[PDB]
Every structure is written in C-alpha cells, then in structure tokens.
C-alpha cells in the first residue's frame, strides 16, 4: 500500500495477507466479506489488490466472474477516457493500467502520489467491489419471500434471518420492513404487529412480539 | 445492478 | 483512525478488525462489548466506525435497530444545527456527514484535524453507543426482580448474577443494593443481612453471608 | 496511555485489551492478577484504567466492591485536597476527576504532562490496587492455619501450597516460616525441622525434608 | 433512555 | 529485504519466515502458493529468496527441479550479458551473482540501491517463479479434459473444479469457457447452455444452470 | 512454457 | 526497559509478559528457563524484573527461596558499598534500591542512564540468576551417578539424558565425559568406548556406539 | 542484534526467541533447521547467538558436540590470529571473545560497528553452522544407498525421499542423479529411465515415470 | 488493610 | 567435512 | 555455589 512517512510505498504485510485468505476460507461470499476486503485493502495499489485476489485458492467460478466484471469496467473506462511517450513523463492510465495488468508498480505509485493524484487503487477497488456484489447476490441461498417465522421461532431469530437474507439479496434502498416482515411473521406475532398501526419502528415491533 | 452490502455509511 | 506522527490518518489494523469481529461472535450483546467497541475505535473516523459495524455478519436485527437509532440522532443533529460551496473551503457537516454516509474520508480528516476541531468521529461514536445501549437492554435475558439466591447457592455467586443483570438492564444511577439485593437473598442470608442494619457496604454483606 | 515520541497520548492496544480480559478469565482473583494489571496499565490515563475495568464481563460482585473502594478513596482525596474557571487554565482535579468520572481525556493528558506533573493515572491506579487487594483477600479459599502437610505429601508441594495461601491472605510483613510452616508439617518432617535449630533458611528446610 | 454500561468512569 | 527509512536493508521477519513455511506445508504446490511467495518476498534480496527456499523441509524433488530451472536461467543471463576489479568499484553481476551463489549481501544491496538500480532481487524472483510454474503444472492432478459435471452435481461446484484445474494446467490465454465448459457439462445443463447462444458470459451460464 | 497462475494483473 | 530512541524508558510489552509467564508454566525450573529469563529481561529496570517475578502464580516455595537469595545479596552489597539528600541530586543506591524495594522508577532510570551509568538492572538481574541457579539445582530430579545407559537404549538417547542432568546439577567446569559417561554406559558400548583410547571426542564416542 | 536507526543494538525479540525454540522442538536436526537458524539470527551479536543456543532444553548430546566444534574453531582462530590494554582503546578479539565467552556485549558492539568492522557475530555464526552441519549428518537416519523406489511407490515420492536423504548426508557437490537415482528406481521406471539416454534432466525423468 | 501481593520490590 | 545444507545460494 | 546453566558464552 501507500502510506505517510511524504507518501511512500510499503509492502503488504503477512498479517494482511493471512487475514484476507482466512476470511474467504471461513465466510466464503457472505456479505460481510466485502467490507472486510475494503478495510484490509486500505491504501492498496492495483498490485496489492491483485495479490489479494490471486492468493485465493478456491472459489474459482467466482474469481472468473470477477475477472469478467473487471474487464467490462476497464472497457467502459477506455470508452469514457481515451488516450492519444514523452521522455521521463507520466503517461495516462488505460483501463488495463488501472487493473494492474499493463502497468508497473512504479507507474502505479506515480499516479497515486501525483499532484493532483490519480487514485488508480481506489478506482480499481470500486470495480472489484462491483464484481463481489454480483457474486454475493448470486450465491445468496434464499429469497426474502421464503423467509417466514416458524410457529415456535422467537421473533428475534426470524428478524435476524430476514435481514441477513435482505443484505445478501441487495435490493434497492427503496425496496429494502413495514410490508414483508409483518406478512411473513407467524399468526400470533402478525396479529400483534397489525394492531401496532403504521409507522412502527423495528424496536417497537421486536418489543411487541418479545 | 445490486445495491451493495454497506449497511452503514 | 487519526494519530500523532502532526495529526495524520492511519489505516485500521487487521488486529483491530479481527478483535471486534471476534468479540461480537463470542460475547454477542453482553454489556462488556460496548466498552470494548469504544476502546477498539479509539481515534476512529466515521469511515472506521462504519467498517467495524459493516464487518459484523450475524445479528442483523440488532444492526438494523442500530441503523434506526443513528438515523434518529442524525435528524436531531440537523434540527439543532442547520446549514445554509466556497472554492477550496471546509463545508459544515450534516447528520449524514457525521454518520459517514454523505462525507468522504478526506472531509472527515479535514473536520477532525481542524483548528478548532470538529470531532465527527466522537460525535458518531456517541450515537452508535446510544444504539448499542438499547440493544443490550432489549437482549437482557432476565429481570432483576427474578434474580433470587438459591437455597444452596453461595452468596458470592448470587451477587455476581444480580449485578450482571443490573448492568445489562441499565436502570438509572439512583435506581441502581440496600433494597432488592437483601429482599432477593435466601432465608438464612436474609436474616443475617437484616441484622447488619442500614448503610452496610457490599463488602460487609458478602463477609456476613460467607 | 502516555508515551515518549515529548510526552504524547497513544491509544490502548488490542493486544493490551485482550491480555487483560484473558488473565481475568483464566486466573480470576488469584494474587498474580494484580501485578499483571499494573504492568498492562503502564503509563495509563484514568480513561485507560476504566476501559480495562469496564471490559470485564463476569465477576460483577468484585467489580461493585472495587467501585465502593474507589469512591471511598475519592472522598478521602477531596477531604485532604479541597478546591476553591480561569479562561484557558488548568483546573485542580477532584477525586472524581482522578477516577475519570468527571474529567475529559484532554484534561487527564494536561495534568499528566504538566510541569510539575500531576500523575492522576498513578494516583487512580493506587486506589484500584487497594480495591483489588481486598478482593484477593476475600476470595482466598483457605486459611493459612488449615494448610497442613499430608502424610505422603512431598515437602516441596506443601511449601508451595503454604506460600500460595500466605500470598492471597496478605498478612503484615511481620506476621508473614519459622513458626507455622514447621508446626503444620507432617510428623516425620517436623522432627527433622525441629532438629535444625533456630534461624534455618527455607532452602535449608527444603533440603532437610527432601 | 438506558443509563449505559460504563460502570467505571 | 530493502525498505525506505533512503533505501536500507532490513532483516527478514519471523512472521514472514513462518508464513512461507506454513503455506508450503498446507498448500503444497496448489497455484495460489505462487502469488503468496511473490507477496511474502516483496523487496527481497537474493539472500532473502534463498532463505525462503532453503527453509522448506519437504518436497525436495520440487526444490531440485527449481534448482535446475534457476541454473538454466543463470546460464542464459550470462550468454546475453557477458562481463569483461577496480578498487572500491561496483562489479557487474553474473547469473550466479543474481542467484545469490557467488555474491555477498553487501554486493546485492549495492546493486539494488544503485542509481540506476540493478534489481537483482526482482530478476532472481522472476527465475524462481518460472521454476514454480513448471512444478505447479507437473503436480496438477487432473487434465481439464477429465473435469466433467456429475448428474447430481450443482453447476457452481463443477465450474469451481473446472477453473481450479485450468489454473494449475496453465494453458495459453487464448486456449484458456465457450467450448469445453459447455461440452463437459451434464446432459440437462448442456441443453440449457446450448440454447443461450454464442457469446454468453459465465455469469449468464451460471444463472441459467442454477 | 506454462502461462503462470496470476489470474489478476 | 530502557531503549535507544537517547536512552529512554519503554513499558514492558504484553508479548514479553506473556512469554515469561508461559515458559514458567510449561518448563518450571528446567535449566533452559534461566537463559530465557535473561533474554526476556534485556534492558530491564529493577521494576521490570520485579514485575516478571511477581506475575508468576505457582511455585511459591521457589519464589520465597529467590527472595531469600536477593536479600542476602542486598546485604552483601551494603557491606561492600556503604552510603553516608542534596536538593535535586542523584543519591547512591543501597541493596534495597537495586532490588526495586526502596527506589522509584525515576531513580532507577536516573542511575541506569547516568554518565557513568550505574547499571542497577544488570546488578539485580545477576542476583536473581544466582537465586534461580540454586532453585534449578535443588529441583533437579536425578543425580548424574544414577544416569546409566539401558541394555537396549540407543547411545544418543543416553547421552541426551546424561548431559541434561549434568546441566541441571551445575557442577564446576572442571568436574563437568572421559570418566562417568564411559563408566555409566552399557556393557557393549563400554567395551567399544574403552578401545577408543584416551582423548576421544564426544562426536567420536557417539559414532563408535552408533 | 545490531540494526540501522547509525548502527545500534536492539534486544532480541520474544517472537525471535519463541520461533527458534519451536523449530528445534518440531524439526529437531532436519536440515532445514540450519537455514532457519541463520535467518532468525540475522544481525546477531555473539551474545544473541549464545542466547539462542542456551534456550534449547533438549538435545544436550547435540549441544555438547556443538560446544566441541566451537572450541576447535576458537583454537584455530587464535593460532592464525595471535594477540600481543591502552586506556579507552579497542582490543583485538581472541577466539573466546568471538564466541562471547570472554567478551562483553559492549565490546561486541564496538567490534561489529567499527570502521572497518570486525564482524564477530558473522564469524561466530560460521562456526556454529559448521557444528550444526556435523550434527545434521550424524543424525541422518538413512544412507542414500538404502533409498530405493517401492514396486507401487509413485516416482515423485521416491525422488522426494532420495533428495531429502541426500540433503541430510551432505556429500560434496560433485558427489551430489544420473547414477544412483536411476539405479535405485524400481524395475519398470528404471527401464524407462535407461531409454531416455544420457543428460536427461530431473524434470524429464519425473515426466517419463509419471 | 491487606498488605498487598507484590512479593518482590 | 560435510558440504552444508544450503541448496540455494 | 552452583556453576550456572549458560553452556554457551
């Protein structure tokens, strides 16, 4: 990554490398893996991001889908930012340079530490997260329509299952409580929730069915 | 496209 | 977080990230999780606080309740601090900027390192702790009225259960020893505690029933 | 804590936080927990000390007794050091300021780094250790009078039990070898120890009964 | 509102 | 390795040493070991690279094959870069100097920190990776032609097996989805994939057979 | 010669 | 401990604290614990040394013997270095000051960083090691005279047992191979060792009986 | 060890100490322990090297053999470098000074940081490695002549056993593939290897018998 | 009051 | 004397 | 007195 000493390059740490490999091994593509990826790649160059992705051993269907998404975003970058070499001068990055495929570490450091900075690490991380979002959605095991409270299931446990599924499915903010959460509750809790009226908070609903 | 998983922020 | 080098940004560490994820996994919403959260987020930006909250995989009912509390506090901030862009100048943070939703890391660093400093990390952490307090209270499994000493239960173990419950229930300082602790003791210890008279310290009570 | 960079504040580390939580979990209030607490809190502010105490999940009877001791020491401080605000000036700390209840981190740093320094962290740590001493004594499972060497117990193992108990019971230095250690030995070793005469060292006693 | 869980400080 | 303080030598860390030994022990020559090697050897001197290779206890057939590849690359270097000692002057590195066999640490530091730099660590790492690539291919247990979807195997699991094998086999980018992945699918999924038409993305194929 | 295993970059 | 930044104080680390506690728990008073103690206490003040000793929970017979040895060495120091307070001046350390009993951390730092330095940490560590040596010898389970090679015991394993015992027993360098090692060997190996003649090295003996 | 801050002394770390103790415990004197020792002792003083050797608890036959080798190398040093004290001047190191037996840490630092430097740590490490080499060879369990491929043993596994043994036995580079590896192969693979002709590489042999 | 548990120092 | 175990370098 | 356990140095 790039850190303050002046902005300088520092090697990716064994702690960082191991943390990422282990979270993928333990959590696969549960939604919380994405914020962990983003945090572990703080200040990362494109090289660092590729290291992190390349160190993953399993899940090669997912990694190939990610590669496709990256290539699509690279192509769209080039369409929106075409480029027309001067001795010792900084060249303009293409999509493949942002993805670390046709750029050197030194070029990446040059862009990231320029004034004004061209944040190729942040741009590439955006594309990677777009790809991971698609994978998380595809690998979500359950539709929100199929999360229904059991006859003997505590309301708290049902709500945990409901919002876990909703997070993975990644519907729009508008689509993403006053509707399906009540409809999918069990007969006894539904009767209680209906009586609360419109505009009840989640806290109030959970208290009511506790 | 999916909305992402960053519940906070 | 923001640290002294001059006040500079530093990436959240893999040790910090892992510690928080593990304490939530191991302790859920036992009261001691809150002081741990506060300590692990020392110097945190709003971005760092969101990273910590977003890396939690389970407990999505709790995380949605927390989101509601944050939104309420953001709205109250805006009501109390309205805002009326000058080139290259620092703008005033709204509730959503304090919560890291509409602000950039660079803006957050700008506010936190200003003279005088606008401590958006500390303000946001306050709102988050308010939310966690509510969750800890809701998820408390036992009322203090139901903590009673068993016939063969050592007084020390009963007092441990009593104050564990009292901590989670979070009654006022005034409400929160000379009353219920004695009344809920077993017949033999109660007789001894009654004879000690008014104003007996906890140490004296524990010695008496040992 | 406060460290040399000039004396500056540094966040309490995840390693420190975890070490303290684990020693309490593993050792409870065995006497060696106190020197560990003191070492882990090297350079600590009152805020840091409170963090350490607040992160403890169990043992709430002990933590409430500790709170009582702290409040007593705070009251005695105020009685011995009364206080009679000038713009931008350092105020005098009260008992509750030393305990981190009515003081801010910035005020604590101000006092601790002043010339001459007002070491509020060291003063508070003293009060906390006074409280822990009482807890260690109360929770000592055995009286020194009941530690007697078994007929087949190696002298070394008996002496280990004897001084472990003596450490927890915390009698005065004068009270705290030439008397009870010999009297509580088994018949065969006692005869040997009696023949050694007055002023025998522990090493000599252990050699004699080996 | 709940009083919080910070027993010390 | 060589780090910025000015570019200075720093000892290889116990964390780095242990991480490499453990990944070889746990992953053998699965393809992801190579990116891990490259990341763990960031900034490495030839001495550091040899340390990493020499600390491996098992797999001595592989390590001897690696030695052969290194010797071949060293010989080709000398053929392309012959060398014709001046007191206190930097000499030109031969193949064996790049491999750390006939060069001292001080000479390696001299070359790596020169202006312009002669990056002997990066050159040697290239040769080592060439050798590791051959080992990964040789030790690949399955041909891509033998990866076929089972009658009851989820398409996702088949695609994972397919691209895992493809990665280890290391065919050309051109050879390395629209052909064999469809042909090796089971009867039901193949019928669906055929109907999608030409140019279907992996995401679309995985959705279709889900 | 083999193409290498660096899927990304 | 005291480190170079200028010589400054630094807090004892949680890693150091834990390492010492664990080695005592795992190795008790096997001889190798002493070099580990010395290495873990590199640069230590008397305060640091006391912290390390005080954090030990078990083995209180040993810790009391150590206290006796320290007190003896302190008394001998005072006999050899008597002391006859000037405002703001450095006083002369007594035995009890070297042991950290009557001295403050600031006084210890003053002595250790003086020109010329009074190395109170190194002096105290010497006394502690003298005490540990006695404990290691006392707790040695076997006399060197009782280490004899079994009829079916490999010579290498016998020699391991022999020198392990010799290390714990701590005889003089002169007393501490050409005598007892041969005499205590089994009949077959003894015959071979006798035929080698005088002045045979350990390597030669081990080869002969292999 | 000695590190750059200027060249300064730094305490050996608990991580380094533990890593060495554990590798000896886990690997004994397998050949890969030697490169690990060398890497863990990067920049070490003679004091540091002795600490590492002294912290080993078992294997005392080996440690006594090592002591003999060190003493032999020290004697040869003195024979080749005799020495004929000036106030405040650096004296010349004898063999025993290089081994850390008659030299102080300060003298060692003086020699190692001199201009020109007298690298006593590197000289001593050389002697130690000479000793370890002898131990690794002595403790090698199998002769290379007895490593023969089983009738059903995969060629790869046989080659692993072959070169593992060859590494431990430490024959000359000339003696240390075209001869014994083929002769000790099983009947079926031997026939194939014979047909390959002279000058076949290990890669080619392993491919042929795969 | 109890004497404390700091055997050394 | 033995040749040592440093296969590389 | 015992000779100590520092075999090396």
Numbering used by the authors:
A (entry chain A), C (entry chain A), D (entry chain A), F (entry chain A), H (entry chain A), I (entry chain A): 1 to 5, 9 to 87, 91 to 182, 186 to 219
B (entry chain B), E (entry chain B), G (entry chain B), J (entry chain B), K (entry chain B), L (entry chain B): 1410 to 1418
Could you pull the original sentences from the published paper?
Here we report crystal structures of assembled HIV-1 CA hexamers with peptides comprising the linear binding epitopes of NUP153 and CPSF6 and the two antiviral compounds PF74 and BI-2. To attempt to explain how these diverse phenotypes are achieved, we carried out interaction studies using a CA that can be assembled into stable hexamers through the formation of engineered disulfide bonds at the NTD-NTD intrahexameric interface. The structures reveal that the binding pocket identified for CPSF6 in CA NTD is actually part of a much larger protein-protein interface that also accommodates NUP153 and is present only in assembled CA. The complete binding site is formed by NTD helices 3 and 4 of one CA monomer (referred to as the ‘first site’) and NTD helices 2 and 7 and CTD helices 8 and 9 from an adjacent monomer (referred to as the ‘second site’).
To understand how CPSF6 and NUP153 interact with hexameric CA we determined X-ray crystal structures with the same peptide ligands used in the ITC studies. Crystals of each complex were obtained in two different spacegroups, hexagonal (P6) and orthorhombic (P212121), similar to those reported for the uncomplexed CA hexamer. Meanwhile, NUP153 interacts with residues N53, L56, N57, Q63, M66, Q67, L69, K70, I73, A105, G106, T107 and Y130. In NUP153, an equivalent interaction is mediated by F1417, which superposes closely with CPSF6 F321. ITC binding experiments confirm that this NUP153 residue is essential, as F1417A has no measurable binding to hexamer. Unlike CPSF6313–327, which forms almost a cyclised structure, NUP153 residues 1410–1417 form an extended linear conformation that runs from F1417 across the face of CA helices 2 and 7 from the second monomer. NUP153 interacts with helix 2 residues P34, I37, P38 and S41 and helix 7 residues I135, L136, N139, K140, V142 and R143. NUP153 also interacts with the end of helix 8, where it meets helices 2 and 7, and hydrogen bonds with R173, Q176 and A177. The side-chain of T1416 interacts directly with CA R173 and with CA Q63 via a water and T1416A abolishes binding by ITC. Only the central 9 residues of the NUP153 peptide have a rigid structure in the complexed crystal structure (1407-TNNSPSGVFTFGANSST-1423).
